[PDB]
Design a protein around this ligand. Sequence first.
Ligand SMILES: Nc1nc2ccccc2[nH]1
Ligand SMILES: Oc1ccccc1Cl
Ligand SMILES: Oc1ccccc1Cl
Lengths: 188, 184
Amino acid sequence: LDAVRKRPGMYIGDTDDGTGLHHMVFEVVDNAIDEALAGHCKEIIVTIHADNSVSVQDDGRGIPTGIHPEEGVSAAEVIMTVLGVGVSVVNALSQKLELVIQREGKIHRQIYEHGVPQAPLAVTGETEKTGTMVRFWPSLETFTNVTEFEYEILAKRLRELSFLNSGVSIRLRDKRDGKEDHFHYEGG
Amino acid sequence: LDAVRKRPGMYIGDTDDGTGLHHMVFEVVDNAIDEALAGHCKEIIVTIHADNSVSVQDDGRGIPTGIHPEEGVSAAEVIMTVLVGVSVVNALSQKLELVIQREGKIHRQIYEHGVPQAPLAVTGETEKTGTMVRFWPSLETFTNVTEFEYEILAKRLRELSFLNSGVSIRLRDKRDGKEDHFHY
Ligand SMILES: Nc1nc2ccccc2[nH]1
Ligand SMILES: Oc1ccccc1Cl
Ligand SMILES: Oc1ccccc1Cl
């Protein structure tokens, strides 16, 4: 990840005007949609939290959790720490990132700070559901000037995406003012 | 450097009891001595600053500044960013200032958590030669014991002065004005 940290603008875009900031959300959304479109009648939920973090949930299969034979860490950690631009770029430029994977009847949790895992991916409990949740806090050391998520930039993009992803339910939630949208195109 | 950031304790030592914190200084000093023991009447100055940073100055030849043919960046940057070594210290420092005097030129570079902020750059002229590294330990890594104890540094630098007989070692505390000069 040091290549991304050295020149953030090359990977995410302009880190001052707010375009790069919103590309962080859209990069995570692209991966969640990729997963959701591969399943049956899946759903993604994008939530803007009151602390200006954004979470993206899907109810797909979950990011693989088994140990990568070569790397010697969970497949999820390899995806988060090895260099669409990739979710690893979002991880590298986030001061905090929370990963929650529900898979094979088990809840897996891991926390990152500036791309560095604070502990190995850990099975913390049990679940009947499946899916992946990524919540990230953009790094205020990288993202300057424009540091808050505009609802309409996310809402407009998710509406456009809905028509290219048939059968995928897309929900947007703003916990700052309670505003919410539901985009669900069922064509084809 | 992510391997170091992931498990700081395995590279520098215990990051809670003050052991690792002081090892950060000793790692930089090892390189400075190494350098300086390849020459003759060299001196190393270790300074504890009021803002809880430590600087190590030497009057050696200076770390090589030219572009590394394989890596495509300055040889100094390769030393600070590739794998114990000063790269470990760089990785676990929230800020690190590098100043190299070599071949008639002063070179400067700043790092934050091991990430270079710009390329090694010529900032002026000089008759002198040497290397200076000033680092601010990351308080995200180093907990409980965050401030440098003078006597922990003094003890180790004394031991080093006997082993490295030709090298002068000065220790300076800018918080309370305390100082020592170890030379065998
Ligand atoms: N605050 C902060 N910024 C960082 C950048 C890279 C790795 C660790 C870091 N901690
Ligand atoms: O399904 C997910 C969700 C977020 C990031 C990456 C993946 Cl694969
Ligand atoms: O002489 C040197 C060399 C490497 C790191 C620090 C110093 Cl002071």
